[PDB]
Structures are given as structure tokens and as C-alpha cells.
Amino acid sequence: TDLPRLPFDNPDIMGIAPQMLALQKEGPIARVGTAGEDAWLVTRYDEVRTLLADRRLRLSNPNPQPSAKSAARAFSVALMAGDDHETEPARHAQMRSLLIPRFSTRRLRLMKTRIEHHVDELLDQLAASAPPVDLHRVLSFRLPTMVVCDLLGVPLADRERFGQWARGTFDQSDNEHSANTFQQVVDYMLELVARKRVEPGDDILSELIAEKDGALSDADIAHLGNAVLLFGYETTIVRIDLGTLLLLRNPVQRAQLAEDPGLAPAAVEEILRLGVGGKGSNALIPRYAHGDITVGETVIRTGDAVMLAIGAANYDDRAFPDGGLFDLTRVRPRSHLAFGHGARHCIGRTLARIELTAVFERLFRRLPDLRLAVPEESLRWQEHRITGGFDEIPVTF
Numbered sequence: 001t002d003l004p005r006l007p008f009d010n011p012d013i014m015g016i017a018p019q020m021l022a023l024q025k026e027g028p029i030a031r032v033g034t035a036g037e038d039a040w041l042v043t044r045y046d047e048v049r050t051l052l053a054d055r056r057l058r059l060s061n062p063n064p065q066p067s068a069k070s071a072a073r074a075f076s077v078a079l080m081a082g083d084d085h086e087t088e089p090a091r092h093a094q095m096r097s098l099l100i101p102r103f104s105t106r107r108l109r110l111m112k113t114r115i116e117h118h119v120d121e122l123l124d125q126l127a128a129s130a131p132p133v134d135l136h137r138v139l140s141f142r143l144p145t146m147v148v149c150d151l152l153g154v155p156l157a158d159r160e161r162f163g164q165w166a167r168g169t170f171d172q173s174d175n176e177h178s179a180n181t182f183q184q185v186v187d188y189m190l191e192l193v194a195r196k197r198v199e200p201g202d203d204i205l206s207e208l209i210a211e212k213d214g215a216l217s218d219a220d221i222a223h224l225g226n227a228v229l230l231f232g233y234e235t236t237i238v239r240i241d242l243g244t245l246l247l248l249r250n251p252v253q254r255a256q257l258a259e260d261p262g263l264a265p266a267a268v269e270e271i272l273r274l275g276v277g278g279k280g281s282n283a284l285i286p287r288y289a290h291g292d293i294t295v296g297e298t299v300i301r302t303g304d305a306v307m308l309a310i311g312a313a314n315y316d317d318r319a320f321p322d323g324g325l326f327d328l329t330r331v332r333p334r335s336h337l338a339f340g341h342g343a344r345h346c347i348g349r350t351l352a353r354i355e356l357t358a359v360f361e362r363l364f365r366r367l368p369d370l371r372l373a374v375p376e377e378s379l380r381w382q383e384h385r386i387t388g389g390f391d392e393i394p395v396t397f
């Protein structure tokens with residue numbers, strides 16, 4: 001008897017930690033220690049999907065004496081209107097009601113066109129440079145920050161100002177740096193709101209300013225803008241890096257995709273499903289039970305913390321035959337859980353798929369000899385950041 005402790009070691013740079021796959025094999029739910037509170041760890045696809053749809057399991061903490069949290073985690077919960085369990089139902093319903101129409105079919109069709117041209121231009125610059133090149137800096141980072149600049153209606157050069165702010169805000173290792181970075185986000189967004197009140201354009205803050213005859217306050221509008229800025233590029237950057245690493249690991253699938261770019265949608269779904277980095281702490285969706293819930297033979301009690309392992313669930317052989325294998329030819333694959341599920345299902349997931357599809361439609365056709373210029377083991381996943389990620393990806397081509 002040895003209580004398992006998160007985070008689990010992973011000897012590889014990607015995939016699921018062996019200890020978590022071991023727990024998965026034993027059963028759907030296990031009590032584990034963490035750096036803070038003990039929690040229930042749920043690792044099988046069916047149970048994770050069921051619990052993500054269970055409205056008794058919520059982001060907000062119901063407990064009278066809540067355990068202490070890093071500044072980074074406190075910011076992420078507040079951005080999601082999860083910081084007050086008594087007001088979360090109304091505030092989170094309004095949050096989703098105000099953001100979902102900012103990603104209409106009209107907007108997404110226009111953005112798809114611009115995204116496709118931008119990837120062509122980014123890859124032309126890459127192809128014309130001398131290796132070794134940092135693919136993370138010149139491709140993975142540039143496309144999703146371009147998109148956020150477009151959503152917010154600001155010049156592209158603004159991303160050189162805000163491009164590290166998601167990482168800084170979400171640095172769980174340094175509360176002072178996290179708080180000081182978030183204040184920069186706030187000041188920037190409040191400036192932007194003031195500008196859009198007199199100079200609106202076809203962008204998100206302009207739309208919120210006009211919403212319900214201007215009933216929203218500037219603080220409310222800026223809060224929603226902060227969520228778009230801080231959730232809207234960093235995780236996409238990380239999926240471009242992981243997608244590239246996975247395709248480089250699987251030359252037969254890479255060659256299938258280079259030959260037929262019509263396989264890119266299917267490849268993007270496999271990338272999201274298999275794309276887990278390092279110890280994979282960002283592939284856990286955290287919750288608290290607001291009422292008792294039975295999982296298998298286990299009672300989760302009101303107030304218990306629960307870690308929903310969407311990463312492990314996406315590797316579950318029960319839901320994906322040969323769950324550890326990258327396979328472009330899967331017939332009717334189950335919907336993976338990389339965007340979550342249920343009440344907090346990722347609001348940007350259709351836009352994120354458009355970005356990833358546009359990249360992997362083109363990447364290995366435009367750079368057929370692309371490959372890492374360093375050993376994989378030299379690539380360092382950044383465990384202290386809520387969003388993880390690699391800091392550089394050196395390639396040759």
C-alpha cells in the first residue's frame with residue numbers, strides 16, 4: 001500500500017505517465033495525493049465523460065475553509081467565473097452566453113481564409129531560412145497570436161507585447177510574477193476597451209460594447225477580453241508543437257498526410273487525442289463535488305476535489321482500439337475529450353481546429369524533409385506553467 005502522488009513521472013517527453021495507465025488498468029477511480037489536497041483521480045473515458053456532464057461536479061470550491069491555491073490557479077478560476085460558488089451559476093451562464101456568439105460561422109469563415117494565407121506566408125519564410133530554425137518561435141507561436149490579434153482587432157505587432165503574458169499569468173511557481181503579469185493584461189485590456197468605445201471594428205470587444213444596448217460595464221467587458229487573450233492562443237501553440245512532434249514520430253502517417261492533405265481533419269483529431277506533454281498535469285480538468293456522486297463502487301462526497309484525466313481517458317483502449325497508436329485511418333473514432341465536455345466545453349474549439357487543420361494541411365507538403373535538429377530528450381516540458389508546453393523546437397529541413 002503506497003498512496004500514489006501527482007504529478008507522476010513520465011520517462012518520455014509525451015504520452016501518459018506509466019503510473020496513471022496502471023491506475024487506469026485497475027479501475028476508473030482512485031484516491032491520490034497531490035501537491036495540495038488529496039483528490040479523486042478518474043482515468044477511464046466513460047467515467048470522465050459522464051462526470052464532465054454531471055452538474056453536481058463544478059469548477060468552484062464549495063468548502064467553508066478552501067485550501068490555498070497559487071496565484072496562477074486563482075486567476076484561471078476567476079477568468080472562468082468560478083471564484084465564488086454562490087454566484088458561479090449565474091455568472092458562468094452569462095459568460096458563455098456572451099462569448100459563444102463571438103465565434104459565429106461568418107467570423108470563422110473569414111478567419112479560415114486569413115489563417116490559410118498566413119500559414120502559407122509563415123511557411124514561405126521558414127522554407128527560405130537557413131537551418132537550424134526554432135519552429136516554435138517562427139510557426140507555432142505566430143499563427144495563434146495572429147488569430148488573437150484578429151479577434152481583438154489590434155495590430156499584429158501587439159502580440160510582441162502580450163505573447164508571453166499567458167505563460168507569466170499561469171506561472172504557478174512565482175506568485176509575484178503571476179500577479180504582476182496579470183496586472184499588465186488588465187491595463188492593456190482596459191486601454192483596448194476605451195479605444196473600441198470610440199473606434200469600433202469587426203471584433204469581439206466592439207460586439208460586447210454594443211451588446212444589450214451597452215448594458216455591460218467596461219470591467220465586465222475587459223474581463224471577457226482577458227479570457228479570450230489568456231485562453232485563446234497559448235494552448236493552441238502547444239498543440240502545434242505536439243502535433244509536429246507526433247507526426248515526426250510516425251513517418252508512415254506523416255507520408256500519408258503529405259500525400260493527401262484531405263487527411264488533415266482526421267490528423268488534427270489524433271493530434272488532440274494523443275497530444276500530451278511531459279508529466280501531463282495540464283491534461284487534468286479539476287473539479288469539486290457540490291453533492292455526493294457515486295462512481296463505480298466509490299462515493300465522492302460533497303466538497304471532495306476530483307481530477308478528471310482527459311489525457312488518460314483519450315488513451316483509453318476501452319474507447320480507442322490501440323489507444324496509444326497514432327492512426328489516421330480510424331473508422332468512426334469516438335469524440336476525444338481534449339476540449340472537455342459538458343457545461344464548460346471549450347468555447348474556441350472550432351477556431352482551434354481551423355488553425356490546426358490549416359497548419360497540418362500544409363506543413364509536410366511545404367517542408368518534406370523537416371525533422372528535429374536536436375534529440376527529443378533535449379526538449380523540456382515546462383511543468384510549472386498551467387499550460388505546460390515546450391520553450392523551443394529546433395528543426396532542420
Ligand code: HEM
Binds near residue numbers: 059228286337347
Ligand atoms: C487546441 C487548443 C485548445 C485546447 C486543447 C483547449 C482546451 C480547453 C479545455 C479542456 C477547456 C475546459 C476547461 C474545464 O472544463 O474546466 C477549455 C475551456 C475554454 N476554452 Fe479552450 N482550448 C483550446 C483553445 C481555445 C481557444 C483558441 C479559445 C478562444 C480563442 C478558447 C477559449 C476557451 C474558454 C473561454 C474556455 C472556458 C469555457 C467555460 O469555462 O465555460 N480555447 N478549453
Ligand SMILES: CC1(C)C[C@H]2C=C(C(=O)O)[C@@H]3COC(=O)[C@]4(CO4)[C@]23C1
Binds near residue numbers: 285286388
Ligand atoms: C481554460 C484552460 C486554459 C483550458 C484547459 C486546457 C489547458 C491546457 O491544455 O493546458 C489548461 C490546463 O489546466 C487546466 O485546468 C485546464 C484543463 O482544464 C486548461 C484550462
